[PDB]
Design a protein around this ligand. Structure first.
Ligand SMILES: CCCCCCCCCCCCC/C=C/[C@@H](O)[C@@H](N)COP(=O)(O)OCC[N+](C)(C)C
Ligand SMILES: CCCCCCCCCCCCC/C=C/[C@@H](O)[C@@H](N)COP(=O)(O)OCC[N+](C)(C)C
Length: 200
């Protein structure tokens, strides 16, 4: 199968949901779509190993919760009720981390699309990391990530891993960008509308 098309197809559906008048985002559909993004960090290599703990484990948790909890709204309401929003391992806290991962990939794709004709992924990877994850990482991690940037695959190599040529990759990557933009906005507002904040 072709991994970018599974991503675009799944997030298009979520986009339709959050673009609708009364959105109800199922934890099952949401968490499944997010797990389709996980292979991307492995492709980029050792620099993004932090995503195992900062993203993959966070998605794993939401997949667990999806068996007993209907929607993202219901999921957050439980944590608000139990006063465990910022508690380590809480579904709401993990949801916030998942949001950041989705955001980083959105920025990554945007920069890859912009830097077409350049076979180096250095700028897209460095800029996406610096914007989304760097403010949440201590010195050691940021240095390790910076070092790992030397081990990035070439742009052409990445596309080969994803099984697309330039033209087809541009379409599905842009499709994710178009879909994740309102999804990320919807997720942010779930926090902000309850004054929960989004920078913790
Ligand atoms: C041969 C040798 C190979 C050596 C292999 C080692 C390379 C892989 C290292 C993986 C990176 C660590 C993954 C951790 C991710 C999360 O825990 C992050 N939150 C950690 O960042 P931190 O800045 O400490 O989080 C903030 C927490 N704090 C505020 C309390 C600092
Ligand atoms: C190669 C250099 C990679 C450095 C990555 C080390 C990761 C640091 C962050 O995860 C910090 N939050 C440290 O996490 P913590 O779990 O408290 O580390 C425990 C340290 N200890 C193993 C020595 C006990």
């Amino acid at each position: 199968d072709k991994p970018l098309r599974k991503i675009s197809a799944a997030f298009k559906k979520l986009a339709i949901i959050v673009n609708s008048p009364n959105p109800e985002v199922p934890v099952t559909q949401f968490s499944h779509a997010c797990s389709l993004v996980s292979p991307l960090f492995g492709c980029l290599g050792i620099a993004f190993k932090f995503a195992e703990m900062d993203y993959v484990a966070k998605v794993d948790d939401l997949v667990r919760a999806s068996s007993s909890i209907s929607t993202l709204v219901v999921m957050m309401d439980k944590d608000i009720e139990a006063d465990c929003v910022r508690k380590a391992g809480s579904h709401t806290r993990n949801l916030l981390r998942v949001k950041r991962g989705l955001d980083m990939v959105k920025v990554l794709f945007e920069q890859i699309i912009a830097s077409e004709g350049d076979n180096s992924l250095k700028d897209p990877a460095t800029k996406s990391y610096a914007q989304v994850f760097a403010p949440h990482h201590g010195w050691a991690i940021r240095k390790a990530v910076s070092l790992g940037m030397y081990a990035l695959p070439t742009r052409a190599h990445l596309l080969n891993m994803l099984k697309e040529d330039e033209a087809a990759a541009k379409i599905h990557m842009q499709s994710y960008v178009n879909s994740s933009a309102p999804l990320i906005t919807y997720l942010d507002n779930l926090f902000l509308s309850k004054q929960l904040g989004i920078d913790w």
